[PDB]
Amino acid sequence: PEAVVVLCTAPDEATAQDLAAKVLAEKLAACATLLPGATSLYYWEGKLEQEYEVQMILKTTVSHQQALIDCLKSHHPYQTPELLVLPVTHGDTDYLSWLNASLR
Amino acid sequence: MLDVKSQDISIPEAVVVLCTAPDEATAQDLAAKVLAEKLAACATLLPGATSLYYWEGKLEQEYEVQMILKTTVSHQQALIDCLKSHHPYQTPELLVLPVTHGDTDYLSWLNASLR
Amino acid sequence: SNAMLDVKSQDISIPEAVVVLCTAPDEATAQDLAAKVLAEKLAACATLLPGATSLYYWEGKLEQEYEVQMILKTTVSHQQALIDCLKSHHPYQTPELLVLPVTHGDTDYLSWLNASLR
Numbered sequence A: 001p002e003a004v005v006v007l008c009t010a011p012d013e014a015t016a017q018d019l020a021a022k023v024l025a026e027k028l029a030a031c032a033t034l035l036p037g038a039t040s041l042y043y044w045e046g047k048l049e050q051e052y053e054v055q056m057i058l059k060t061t062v063s064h065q066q067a068l069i070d071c072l073k074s075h076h077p078y079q080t081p082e083l084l085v086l087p088v089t090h091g092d093t094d095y096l097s098w099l100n101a102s103l104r
Numbered sequence B: 001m002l003d004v005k006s007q008d009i010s011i012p013e014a015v016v017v018l019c020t021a022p023d024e025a026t027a028q029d030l031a032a033k034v035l036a037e038k039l040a041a042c043a044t045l046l047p048g049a050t051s052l053y054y055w056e057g058k059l060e061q062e063y064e065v066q067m068i069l070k071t072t073v074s075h076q077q078a079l080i081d082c083l084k085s086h087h088p089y090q091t092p093e094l095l096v097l098p099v100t101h102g103d104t105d106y107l108s109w110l111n112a113s114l115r
Numbered sequence C: 001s002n003a004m005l006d007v008k009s010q011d012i013s014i015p016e017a018v019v020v021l022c023t024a025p026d027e028a029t030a031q032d033l034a035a036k037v038l039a040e041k042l043a044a045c046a047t048l049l050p051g052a053t054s055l056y057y058w059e060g061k062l063e064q065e066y067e068v069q070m071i072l073k074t075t076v077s078h079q080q081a082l083i084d085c086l087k088s089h090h091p092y093q094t095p096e097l098l099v100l101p102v103t104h105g106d107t108d109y110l111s112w113l114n115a116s117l118r
């Protein structure tokens, strides 16, 4: 059971909830955590840009990571939203079993 | 087949454990316990996280606390077992992510902190 | 990937992208640190989560602080210079400075992130 976490940055909690709902309804993720009140900073053409966003963490498997990314991207209002995968190298076996059973 | 020794996911220098607690009191207690036992070096809490999932055919949204605990690969199983046993849920989220590099002095403190 | 290759020979490596975790004592400090590493092009972007609670067990007593969880997006080539920059400007003696590897991601986002460090 090869789990991963997918980080995605949403503009607000409404949007993060809509995104999470979509991917969970398509069984591309087992569950989603939303972390509100994120301040993002970027540096474009000589100027620092600050925004207030929501950090999402979506729990899935390597087999589903691409389709998850593609679905999130499609439904996301941004053209090129942050979508990154981190590996899970360990975890509780029963949890990892539920995570994997949950998926399409 | 392929060796990426400076991004070597197979041999972590440290680990970060994600655990979700139902409320802030429980998360502080879970943190206190694993810290006092020297199974993690630091715990970071983010209360008011929202968890979204299907359970029993229905889409839930729950207020929960995101826990981030710092430890080493040698301690990861002991940490997870301790968290799980003390956690009110039977099967809480307990996931471990690899650290492929860390500030030397920090890693020295982390090792010095753990049993 | 976009390589016209047998699926066995596709995606044989991982992105140079990494995420760096650091904790700061307060929002203004976290913002100034982030802005510095960005100005120096040691990260592509920074995400801050203010109003976190950290707990430590130092010298036999549990301690609890309000802190900012920082997550910096960078690459393996820059991870050491980023850490060294954060460390030099951090108020703490031995701040948390940990690199997590990104193993996959949206291609266009990873292209922008790679280009950002140039």
Ligand SMILES: [Mg+2]
Pocket: B007, C014, C015, C016, C017, C018, C101, C102, C103
């Ligand atoms: Mg990577």
Ligand code: NA
Pocket: A073, A074, A075, A076, A077, A078, A079, A080
């Ligand atoms: Na989009």
